[PDB]
């Protein structure tokens, strides 16, 4: 998933 990447977790609270 994108939350597998630290970036998506920070950048996108929608994704995570």
């Amino acid at each position: 998933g994108c939350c597998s990447d630290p970036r998506c977790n920070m950048n996108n609270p929608d994704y995570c």
Side-chain angles (χ1 to χ4, degrees):
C2 216
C3 301
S4 310
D5 203 294
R7 295 173 300 152
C8 307
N9 183 271
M10 300 174 181
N11 300 330
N12 283 271
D14 301 276
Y15 284 53
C16 305

